[PDB]
Write a protein that binds this ligand. Structure first.
Ligand SMILES: Cc1cc2nc3c(=O)[nH]c(=O)nc-3n(C[C@H](O)[C@H](O)[C@H](O)COP(=O)(O)O)c2cc1C
Ligand SMILES: Cc1cc2nc3c(=O)[nH]c(=O)nc-3n(C[C@H](O)[C@H](O)[C@H](O)COP(=O)(O)O)c2cc1C
Ligand SMILES: O=C(O)c1[nH]c(=O)[nH]c(=O)c1CCc1cccc2ccccc12
Ligand SMILES: O=C(O)c1[nH]c(=O)[nH]c(=O)c1CCc1cccc2ccccc12
Lengths: 313, 313
C-alpha cells in the first residue's frame, strides 16, 4: 500500500506538501523540501522585488499553534522563477510557485513571465489572494469584486490552469459568494483552503506583552487553533466547486488530521506550523500515520474516502 | 486586593459572568447563575416568540473547545422580561438581558417593552448582532449597513445605554469599519467581543462523521480554539472605542486566560464553553486563580492592568 496520486497532470508520491511560507524561502529551504518525503513543495509567496519583511520577532509558536506577521519576506520573483526554470529537480516531485503581488498589475506582470516556464517545466501557479488591496478595503479575497478582477486579469495574462490560496471564511453567504466567484474562472483548477486565521493576538501573561513586534502583536494564526475552521472551508469549497480540486491547509499535525482534511474533500494536504516546528521529518510520520488509519479502516485508496464525511440524518 | 468593578452605574463583585447562551435559558438556569459566585449573569438571547431551536445533537464539546448550531432555542421575550421585572434578585448581582431578534422590527419591539423595566430595575441590555437577518446575506454584524440600521433603530426605540455582542473580525479594515459604526452610537456603552467563530466544522475520525446535526455539521466554535481571536477583538475595539467599555468573551478556562482578556482591555469577562463543561463552580476557581496572579504581580485592582498589554518596541 502506497499514497501515490495524479492531479493537474502531475504524479505525486503522497498528498503532503509544505504550506506556502514555511521552509520555502531560500534555495537551501527549497532543496531541503525537495529532499524530504513530501509529495510536492510550494515556494514562498513572492513579489516582483525582494522584500526584507517585518522586524523580528515576527513568528512565534506555542502548544496550540502559531502567530505570524512576516511581512512577506522573500527573495523576489526572479529568484523563484530561476529556481523553477533551472534549479528544481522535477524528477523528485512537482513544484508549485506562489505569487502575491501588491497590485493586480504586479501579479499580471509576474504571471506573464511564469507562463512560458509553466509550459516548459510544468511548475504550477498558486495565487495568494490574501494580498493587499486598495485603501480602506480588506485583503483581496475579502473584497469579492476585487477578487473577480484579479482572477479575470490573471486568467487572461496567464492562460493556463492555476490555483488560488484562500483565507478562511466564517459565514455561509460568504462561502456561497466566494465559490461563485471562483467558479467563473475555468482556469482555476485548485483552491487551497486555508491561509492563516487573520489578525489574532497572542499575549504572554508573565511579561504582560504581545509576542510579535509588527502590528502591535496582531498576526495570522495557524496550527491547532484553526483545524475546525480549515475543515469547514475545505468542505464548503469541495461542495461548491465540483469541477475544481480543493487542497487542505490548516492544523495538520498528524495523519489523523490529514485524514480529516481528506474526508472533508482535500486532494493535497499542506503542512505549515507543524512543519515549522517539527521539521521535514514530519512528512514520513504523516505518511505512516495516514496509511495506518487507512489500514485499520480497510481503505486502500484516498479516493475511497475523499469528500465522504458523513452528515447526520 | 480586589476584583470589584463599578461600571454602567452598577457594582460587580468580580468581572466574571456567563456568556449568553450558556446556563441561562430557563428560570432554573438563571437562579443557578444568580446563586453562583459570578459577578453578573446574562439571559439567553431571545426572540419575541419561544423557539425550540434546531434538532439534536446541536452542541458538542472536546478538549480544545466546542461547536454549536443551536438555532436560538429560548423561552421568548416575555419570559425573560418577566424574569428581569419580577423574579431576579438584584441585590445578589446585576442582570443583563440579551436580545437577538430575527429582524430589525422584532428587536425594536422588544427593546420598546424592555425600556421601562431597564429604567425601573436596572437590567442591562445586550443586543446580539452576531446573528442572521435575510438568509443568503451575512450575519448582521458582517453587513455594515444592516448593522447601522439595527443600531439606529434600536437606539431610537430604547433610548437608554445598551451594549452589543459582536462576532469576531479577521481583517484590520473590518475592525476599523465596525468600530466606526459603533462609535456613531453614543448609547452603545459596551461591546462584547466575541461571539463564536462562525461556521467551523468538527469531524470525528472514527465515525467519519460530523458531530452536530444542523447545517451539515457546520457551527460556531468556542473555547481554546478561539482565545487569540478573542483577545485580538477585545484589544482592537478597546483601542478604537475609547468612550465605550469592552467585555471579553472567548477561550476563558482559567484565571490566566481572564488576566489576558483584561490586559487586552476587557472590563467584564464572560465564560461560555468552559462554564458549559465545568458548571458554575468554575467561578470560584477563576476568582481564586485571577487573585493569585494579581498577588504575584503586586496588582491590587483590575484597573491597574486593564488595557495595559505591552507592545514590542
Ligand atoms: C511563517 C509563515 C509564513 C507564511 N507565509 C505564507 C505565504 O507566503 N503565503 C501563503 O500563502 N501563506 C503563508 N502562510 C500561511 C500558511 O501557508 C498556512 O496557510 C497557515 O499557516 C495555516 O496552516 P497551518 O495551520 O498548518 O499553519 C504562512 C504561514 C507562516 C506560519
Ligand atoms: C450552546 C451555546 C449557545 C450560545 N448561544 C448564544 C446566544 O444565545 N447569544 C449569544 O450572544 N452568544 C451565544 N453563544 C456564544 C457565547 O456567548 C460565546 O460568545 C462563545 O461561546 C465564545 O465564548 P467561549 O469560548 O467561552 O465559549 C452560545 C454559545 C454556546 C456554546
Ligand atoms: O508573509 C506574511 O506575513 C504572510 N503570513 C501568512 O500567514 N499568510 C500570508 O499569506 C502572508 C503573506 C500575505 C501578503 C501577501 C502579499 C503581500 C504582503 C505584504 C505584507 C504582508 C503580507 C503580505
Ligand atoms: O443559536 C445559536 O446557534 C447561536 N450560537 C452561538 O454560538 N451564538 C449565537 O449568537 C447564536 C444565536 C445566533 C445564531 C447564530 C448562527 C445561526 C443561527 C441560526 C438561527 C438563529 C440564530 C442563529
Amino acid at each position: 500500500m502506497c499514497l501515490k496520486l495524479n492531479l493537474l497532470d502531475h504524479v505525486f508520491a503522497n498528498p503532503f506538501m509544505n504550506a506556502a511560507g514555511v521552509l520555502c524561502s531560500t534555495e537551501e529551504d527549497l532543496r531541503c523540501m525537495t529532499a524530504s518525503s513530501s509529495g510536492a513543495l510550494v515556494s514562498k509567496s513572492c513579489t516582483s522585488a525582494p522584500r526584507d519583511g517585518n522586524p523580528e520577532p515576527r513568528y512565534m509558536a506555542f502548544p496550540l499553534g502559531s502567530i505570524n506577521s512576516m511581512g512577506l519576506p522573500n527573495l523576489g520573483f526572479d529568484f523563484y522563477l530561476k529556481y523553477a526554470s533551472d534549479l528544481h529537480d522535477y524528477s523528485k516531485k512537482p513544484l508549485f510557485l506562489s505569487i502575491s503581488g501588491l497590485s493586480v498589475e504586479e501579479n499580471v506582470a509576474m504571471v506573464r513571465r511564469l507562463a512560458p516556464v509553466a509550459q516548459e517545466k510544468g511548475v504550477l501557479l498558486e495565487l495568494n489572494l490574501s494580498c493587499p488591496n486598495v485603501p480602506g478595503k480588506p485583503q483581496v479575497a475579502y473584497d469579492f469584486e476585487a477578487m473577480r478582477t484579479y482572477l479575470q486579469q490573471v486568467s487572461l495574462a496567464y492562460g493556463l490552469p492555476f490555483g488560488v490560496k484562500m483565507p478562511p471564511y466564517f459565514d455561509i453567504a460568504h462561502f456561497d459568494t466566494a465559490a461563485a466567484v471562483l467558479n467563473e474562472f475555468p482556469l482555476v483548477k485548485f483552491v487551497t483552503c486555508v491561509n492563516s486565521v487573520g489578525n489574532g493576538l497572542v499575549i504572554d501573561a508573565e511579561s504582560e506583552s504581545v509576542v510579535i513586534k509588527p502590528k502591535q502583536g496582531f498576526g495570522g494564526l495557524g496550527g491547532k487553533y484553526i483545524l475546525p475552521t480549515a475543515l469547514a472551508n475545505v468542505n464548503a469549497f469541495y461542495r461548491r466547486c465540483p469541477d475544481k480540486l480543493v487542497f487542505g491547509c490548516g492544523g495538520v499535525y498528524s495523519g489523523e488530521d490529514a485524514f480529516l482534511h481528506i474526508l472533508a474533500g482535500a486532494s493535497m494536504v499542506q503542512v505549515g506550523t507543524a512543519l515549522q516546528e517539527e521539521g521535514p521529518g514530519i512528512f514520513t510520520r504523516l505518511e505512516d500515520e495516514l496509511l495506518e488509519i487507512m489500514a485499520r479502516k480497510g481503505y486502500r485508496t484516498l479516493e475511497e474516502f475523499r469528500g465522504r464525511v458523513k452528515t447526520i440524518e
